[PDB]
Amino acid sequence: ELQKQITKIQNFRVYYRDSRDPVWKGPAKLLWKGEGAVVIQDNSDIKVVPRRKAKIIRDYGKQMAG
Amino acid sequence: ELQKQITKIQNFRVYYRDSRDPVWKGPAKLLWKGEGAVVIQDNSDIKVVPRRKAKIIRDYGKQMAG
Amino acid sequence: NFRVYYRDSRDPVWKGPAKLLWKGEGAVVIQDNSDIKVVPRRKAKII
Amino acid sequence: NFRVYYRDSRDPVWKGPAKLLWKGEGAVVIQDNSDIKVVPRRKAKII
Amino acid sequence: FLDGIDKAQEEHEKYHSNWRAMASDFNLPPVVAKEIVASCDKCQLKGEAMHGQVDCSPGIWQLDCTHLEGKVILVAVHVASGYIEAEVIPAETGQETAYFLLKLAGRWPVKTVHTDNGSNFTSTTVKAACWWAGIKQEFAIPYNPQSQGVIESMNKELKKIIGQVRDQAEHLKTAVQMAVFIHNFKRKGGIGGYSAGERIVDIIATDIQTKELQKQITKIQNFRVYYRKGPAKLLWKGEGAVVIQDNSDIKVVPRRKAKII
Amino acid sequence: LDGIDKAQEEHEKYHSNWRAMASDFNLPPVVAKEIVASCDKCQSPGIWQLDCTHLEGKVILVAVHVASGYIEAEVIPAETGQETAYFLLKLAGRWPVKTVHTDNGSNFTSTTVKAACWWAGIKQEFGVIESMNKELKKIIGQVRDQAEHLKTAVQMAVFIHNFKRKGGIGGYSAGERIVDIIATDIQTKELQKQITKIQNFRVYYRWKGPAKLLWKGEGAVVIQDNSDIKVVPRRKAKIIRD
Amino acid sequence: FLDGIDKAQEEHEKYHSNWRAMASDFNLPPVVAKEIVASCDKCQLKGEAMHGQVDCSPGIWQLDCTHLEGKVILVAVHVASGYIEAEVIPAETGQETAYFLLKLAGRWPVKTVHTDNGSNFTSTTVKAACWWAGIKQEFAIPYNPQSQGVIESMNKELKKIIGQVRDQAEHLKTAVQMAVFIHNFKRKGGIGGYSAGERIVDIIATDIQTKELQKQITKIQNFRVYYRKGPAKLLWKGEGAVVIQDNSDIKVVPRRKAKII
Amino acid sequence: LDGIDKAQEEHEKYHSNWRAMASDFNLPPVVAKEIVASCDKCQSPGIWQLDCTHLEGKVILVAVHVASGYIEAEVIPAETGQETAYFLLKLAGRWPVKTVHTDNGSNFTSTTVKAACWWAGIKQEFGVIESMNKELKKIIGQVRDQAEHLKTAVQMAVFIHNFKRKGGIGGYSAGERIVDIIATDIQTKELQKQITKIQNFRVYYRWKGPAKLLWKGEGAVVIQDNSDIKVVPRRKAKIIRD
DNA sequence: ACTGCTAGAGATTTTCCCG
DNA sequence: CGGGAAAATCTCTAGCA
DNA sequence: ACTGCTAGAGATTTTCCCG
DNA sequence: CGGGAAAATCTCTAGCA
Ligand SMILES: C[C@@H]1CCO[C@H]2Cn3cc(C(=O)NCc4ccc(F)cc4F)c(=O)c(O)c3C(=O)N12
Ligand SMILES: C[C@@H]1CCO[C@H]2Cn3cc(C(=O)NCc4ccc(F)cc4F)c(=O)c(O)c3C(=O)N12
Ligand SMILES: [Mg+2]
Ligand SMILES: [Mg+2]
Ligand SMILES: [Mg+2]
Ligand SMILES: [Mg+2]
Ligand SMILES: [Zn+2]
Ligand SMILES: [Zn+2]
């Protein structure tokens, strides 16, 4: 039930930026999604990121590649 | 005689750049000066640098400051 | 308070000082002679 | 040999391929239809 | 430094020497010379060296008009994905910009449009078009094209592709549609190696799926957390850390000094 | 890895597809695809129908994505080959169109339309479109008073049909359905690409005869030998390209 | 990949897909797809992302004309130091550019002048002026202002100072001379915290002194070095390393496998 | 550090200046300056003369750097205050002019010239210039045929005098001499700045009474106590600002 | 109270592949 | 564990006008 | 065969100064 | 050896038009 939904939401990849860094960070794991904020885990570091700085997808290619 | 001239020439400071680096390096010590090339010592590293990439001075302020 | 000097719109002349009303990431909102203006932080200096 | 494609002078259209005569740091000298031209490396691609 | 300061300000009033010059010439600490400079209105001639970052929410599109061979091309880009829609229009008017916007809103979930202050984008007709389609209108700071960096960059890319394929079409409109096709489906790169079309499909589908999944999770996972405070709503737990939202303030706290009820 | 036998048993018992086995048993999609294709007893997204309708003396050219119900429509000045080719090139630029179904009309059999289809890689073949023309006409009659010109009303109707009208099993709009279907098609194409990439490799393990390579993991190699799937360590097997 | 390649080139001829697009769509190695792209003439539309570096020999000056309040300002900068000389001129002509250059050569050791291809700088009169004063003339690649980055940047700085002090002078020429004064002596910074005037004096004096000192050293220190070759002339020795010049090729070799005679 | 006693002995024996002691004995310039100023028995670069000469009915305004012999000259349209002020502002922009010596002429006592001097910080005071006008006239007569206009010939003469004519003890040109003199003046000003910065500090060592601070080195502190210079370790002394 | 970005060229660093 | 080759990441640029 | 640079604003890192 | 404050180095920008 809940655990399946949780692992499904953590399968998504998040690309994001910090307020003063124009470079896009690597794919971080999605933990929670809100209206204005997204909560991610990037290299064992839990970061809260505004929705306007986050690109969330799946990356079908990797979901097929295993 | 020769040693005094040598230490006098090594008192000069050299500012320089590498062929693909727009930043100017710190003051390296001048070892030899030629028409088209200058030979410097920068952090225990002897580098040959074209004359067109080298700004050589004394820095009177440091020569007074000791 | 803060002093803001700024370049507004295609006018090379810097103006100010203006009262800082709001500082965001990328832009600031200022008041200069009762004229509220929105200026990118690239075009303003806050002192 | 090398193929050089280049932008010469205020003309947005890229031209080539031209024969590479000389490669310096910052610029290249090329021959295109017997017209030797000097082009900054910012405005050329050597293949 | 009273004598040194006064001689410095007199020098600055005439020459406007930078803080280094006054510090050297008048034996002043760097703070004092910088104070003299900073207190001079005529020496405030440069802004901070930085660049902002434009919104990339899944619903924002950036629209602009570009010009090619004497015609007008209306261009829109989905910021999150880089997917573009372009159309040649006979004139930069609010009527046809509104029509383009109606079509776009009918084809994709457009929540917000970000434009410069061109008269076509600020027109009453476009405002009515956005209101009926439920699209929020955002206008850049005037004469700041950087606020439209995405669409402005897309204008360059679109014109670049048009030049490449301009010889396979007689008319410019056909070439523009060919270039739009090439950009959306024949150029791969970016954050997932996607084409723009694949990327926008992924973005939109992912938004829908994540919304549904998080709705189910919040329906099932209903807990209140006390840390260090009030009953903060539980968002996520695990790996020795707990994410909570206390009074619309999301913060990350360790599992220690926190209890989930 | 460990769940391959469980997936085989589940597929034999319930005739499940590869997606279900991959999702439930945490297996790579290629292994589940091999499992689902190993049994003989267990054996659209780019199709559009194009038609012209007439309304108030104006020609409305309508495109329907068959799988989802999604609609692309605009008033065109005339029912000629040029406007049809322009509209179809537009559609091919916006969505991944592979095949168009038409009614052998004059504007659909024109050389301009065929040239556009050849350029965009669209395959031309000469009842959904009729019912959807009826539905679009209904929505247009509903929202006609909100616009002066017919084209604006048509685009309002397209917007309403694609995003405001919901139905079906899940109560989804047409736009949601098309997005999901295209995402699934993207997944299928990615899986096919990876299968094509890996099917040219042969693995010798423990040496035993060549075996079909299925997955090259971080800690194991999944192979298929004699219509059976075996997991072997990476250091115990050699992978070569034939 | 013969079938995959051929389908890729046919796709590229129509759409000009980038190497990623063909590699994904046609299962090609990155090298093959990049080969297809690189072999397409119409896809060669961008140069390498780099910047050259202009000569900063002690004798080079960069000259340019700028325009302010309807007048012409001729500007020269000593590249090594940033020291500038400017003068308002009534017209961009070779006569007055040559006169400015004669004055500059009479006041400072000008060995080389680097200009864009403005008609005043390419004039016959300026060529005669340089020939009599012994000044080598260097012309930038046409329509490449980056080749004059130093003087072009100085144009910005000079105009910036002129605006600051424009109200203390009635005429523009007086303001230009005030701005030149401020730049050369009232602004400190750069590689030695110098003003531009102090820096140019240091550069020129250092050049003279180093020339004399090295002349004396080479007069006294006359040795030939054999390493690994021929009798390479000795340049400098010490710290376990020897610097030699073998057939007009200066190289650094360790003290080992080298003998000084 | 170790050579302070040797420098003191050398200065007492030969009345040497601080530059010689610093160069020969590897001492910081401040310590040598203190040594040279400690004995009572041992006790220009910004001065220019400005004058107008007449030639071929045209006014030539000449500037001479007294210390070096360097010349700045140009033909001016008229002998008025405006042109003199413009020329002097030019010169002050090019070289560090502190004082101008003139002949109390009408163009030199004008309010415009005084305002220019006040703006540039030049001090106005009302035989070198006469001889140098003669020399410039000689060079102009030598190179007059090489130009059509008098101003170009004047600038050629200025170039020749400053760089092609060499003389004196070292056989140097005027440009070399002015560059050297200005460099020496820069050195003097830097030394004065550092002396002013350090003279406000007092050092307590080993505690003994306050002593004048001379040098704050990386491994030692040089102080002057009771008209004598002593070297003490940094950790053995405390430096405070008064 | 809002905001540079994109994608290609060339360089440099990781990862992986067989020993 | 060791190099080599390919992949991945990184650095930087023009143009959008 | 020739070539982006400069200087100011703000951030981040070193150095130094007394314990 | 330890923090704090000031100095130094570093990062990045507009304008030169
Ligand atoms: C009449 C409307 C209303 C108000 O202002 C004008 C003028 N303008 C000027 C540019 C421009 O300068 N592009 C070059 C550029 C420079 C920097 C950067 F980061 C991005 C860039 F694209 C545009 O692109 C543009 O669309 C307009 C426009 O539409 N208008
Ligand atoms: C008629 C002569 C002869 C041939 O070409 C023209 C045109 N031109 C154009 C610029 C210019 O575009 N400056 C902006 C800029 C851009 C980039 C950069 F790195 C440096 C920069 F200064 C000049 O400055 C300039 O002097 C000229 C000029 O003199 N001429
Ligand atoms: Mg616009
Ligand atoms: Mg634009
Ligand atoms: Mg020019
Ligand atoms: Mg210029
Ligand atoms: Zn000021
Ligand atoms: Zn191509």
- Rounded Cα gap, residues A51 and E211, in angstroms: 13
Cα E6–Cα E9–Cα E12 angle in degrees, nearest 5 = 150
Structure tokens at G99: 């006169």
Per DSSP, the three-state class of H31 is helix
How far, in Å, from the CA of E1 to the mean position of ligand 3? 54
Q: What is the 3-state secondary structure (H, E, C) of chain F?
A: CCCHHHHHHHHHHHCCCHHHHHHHHCCCHHHHHHHHHCCHHHCCCCEEEEEEEEECCEEEEEEEECCCCCEEEEEECCCCHHHHHHHHHHHHHHCCCCEEECCCCCCCCCHHHHHHHHHHCCEEECCHHHHHHHHHHHHHHHHHHHCCCHHHHHHHHHHHHHHHCEECCCCEEHHHHHHHHHHHHHHHHHHHHHHHHHCCEEEEECCCCCEEEEEECCCCEEEEECCEEEEECHHHEEEEEC
Q: For E49-77, b where at least 16 C-beta lie within 10 A, e where not — what string? A: eeebbbbbbbbbbbbbbbebeeebbbbbb
Cβ distance E210 to A48 less than 8 Å, yes or no, reads no
| Cis peptide bond upstream of C17, omega within 30 | yes
Number of Cβ within 10 Å of residue B33's Cβ equals 24
Q: Which residues line ligand 1 (CB under 6 A)?
A: E 64, 116-118, 143, 145-146, 149, 152
User: Rounded to whole angstroms, how far apart are CA atoms G115 and A6?
Assistant: 67
Containing H/E element for E72? strand E71-78
Residue type, G50: M
* Other Cβ atoms within 10 Å of F124 Cβ, number: 18
Residue F124 CA to residue F116 CA, distance in Å, equals 11
Distance separating alpha carbons of residues H202 and H241, to the nearest angstrom: 6
Q: What angle in degrees, to the nearest 10, is found between the helix axes of G19-26 and G2-15?
A: 140
Cα G201 to chain center, whole Å? 20
Q: Checking DSSP bridges between strand H47-55 and strand H99-101, what pairing results, if any?
A: parallel
Of the candidates F206, F209, F223, F208, which has an alpha carbon nearest to the alpha carbon of residue F1?
A: F223
The Cα-based distances of E2 to E6, E27, E32, F77 in angstroms read 6, 11, 11, 83
CB atoms closer than 10 angstroms to residue F106 = 10
Which of C19-23's residues contact partners 24+ apart within 8 Å by CB, and which partners?
C20/C46
What does this entry list as its resolution, in Å? 2.2
At D9, give phi and psi (nearest 5°): -155, 100
Q: Give distance CA E48 / C1' L13 (Å).
A: 7
The backbone region for G46, taken as left when phi is positive above 0, alpha when psi lies in -120 to 50, beta otherwise, is beta
The reply to whether E30 touches chain G by the CB within 8 Å rule is no
Cα(H75)–Cα(B48) distance, integer angstroms: 47
β-sheet bridge partners, residue H212:
H202, H224
D10 contact to strand K (CB, 7 A limit): no
Q: Is residue B52 part of a domain?
A: yes
- How would you class H9 by CB atoms within 10 Å of its CB: exposed for 0-12, middle for 13-18, buried for 19 or more? exposed
Query: Is H112's Cβ below 8 Å from some Cβ in G?
Result: no
Protein residue closest to L8, using CA and C1': B26
Q: What is the token pair recorded at C36? A: 């509220």
Instruction: Return the number of other C-beta atoms located less than 10 Å from residue C21's C-beta.
Output: 14
Q: Beta E60-68 vs E71-78: how paired, if at all?
A: antiparallel
Three-class secondary structure of residue B30 per DSSP: strand
d(CA E247, nearest CA chain F) in Å? 33
Question: Is there a contact between E232 and E213 (Cβ–Cβ < 8 Å)?
Answer: no
Report residue F219: phi and psi, to 5°. -125, -5
Q: How far is CA F182 from CA E80, E203, G57, in A?
A: 18, 12, 63
Contact yes or no for E186 and G161 at CB 8 A: no
Q: Which of H169, H168, H147 is nearest to H158 (CA)?
A: H147
* F42 labeled part of a ligand binding site: yes
* CB of G118 sitting under 6 A from ligand 2: yes
Under a CB-based contact definition with an 8 Å cutoff, are residues F190 and E193 in contact?
Answer: no
Distance from C-alpha of E124 to C-alpha of F96, rounded to nearest angstrom: 35
Facing residue for G202 by CB, picked from H92, H93, H183: H183
Residues 6+ apart with CB under 8 A from A35: A51
Q: Where are the domains of chain D?
A: 1-47
Q: How far is CA H55 from the centre of its chain?
A: 32
Distance from CA of E111 to the nearest CA of F (A): 12
For residues G106 and H174, what is the distance between their CA atoms, to the nearest angstrom?
11
Structure tokens at E181: 């096709």
Nearest to D44 by CA among D19, D33, D34, D35: D19
Domain assignment present for residue B6? The answer is: no
Contacts of B64 in chain H (CB under 8 A): 29-30, 187, 190-191, 194
- Closest C-alpha to F88, from F128, F132, F124: F124
Q: Count Cβ neighbours within 10 Å for each residue of B49-66 and write b for 16 or more, e otherwise.
A: bbbbbbbbbbbbbebbbb
The whole-angstrom distance between G198's CA and the closest CA on chain E is: 12
Parent domain of F226: 200-240
Which residue, by CA, sits nearest to atom 29 of ligand 1? Answer: E118
Question: Which residue, B9, E93, H18, E81, is CA-closest to G238?
Answer: B9
Distance I14 C1' – F236 CA (angstroms): 25
Answer yes or no: are the C-beta atoms of H221 and H215 closer than 8 Å.
Answer: yes
Q: Give nucleotides in strand J with any atom < 7 A to a protein C-beta.
A: 6-7, 9-17
CA of A32 to C1' of J6 (A): 37
Closest approach atom of ligand 2 to CA G143: 5
Q: Are D3 and D14 in contact (CB under 8 A)?
A: no
Residue ranges at the known binding site of E for Zn(2+): 12, 16, 40, 43
Nucleotides of chain L in contact with protein CB (under 7 A) are 6-7, 9-17
C-alpha closest to that of E100 among E89, E91, E109, E90? E89
Residues on chain F touching E197 (C-beta within 8 angstroms): 94-96
| Residues of chain F with C-beta less than 8 angstroms from the C-beta of A65 | 28-29, 190, 194
CA B16 from centroid of its chain's CA atoms:
8
- Pick the closest to residue F3 from F17, F24, F33, F18 (CA basis): F24
Give, for ligand 1, the residue of E152, E158, E159, E160 to mutate: max count of ligand atoms closer than 8 Å to Cβ.
E152
Q: Checking phi first, is residue D44 left (phi over 0); if not, alpha (psi -120 to 50) or beta?
A: beta
* Cβ atoms within 10 Å, residue H71: 26
Cα–Cα distances in Å, from E209 out to E214, E216, F22, F180, F222?
9, 11, 18, 9, 31
Our count of domains for chain B comes to 1
Chain A closest CA to F30's CA: distance in Å?
Answer: 7
Residue nearest to nucleotide J11 (CA to C1'): G49
Q: Which of E254, A65, E186, H219 is nearest to F22 (CA)?
A: A65
Secondary structure class of D16 (helix, strand, coil): strand
F93: left (phi over 0), alpha (psi -120 to 50) or beta: alpha
- Which of G122, G152, G157, G160 has most ligand 2 atoms within 8 Å of its beta carbon, as the pocket-test mutant? G152
Residues sharing a CB contact under 8 Å with residue B1, sequence separation 6 or more, in sequence order:
G220
Asked if E217 and A9 touch (Cβ cutoff 8 Å), the reply is yes
Whole-number Å distance between alpha carbons of G188 and E18: 7
Helix (H) or strand (E) holding A29, with range, is strand A28-33
For residue A18, give every residue at least 6 positions away whose Cβ sits within 8 Å of its Cβ, in sequence order, or none: A25, A53
Nearest listed ligand to the Cα of residue G11: 8
Strand pairing category for C35-40 and C44-46: unpaired
Does residue G49 sit at the B interface (CB-CB below 8 Å)? Answer: no
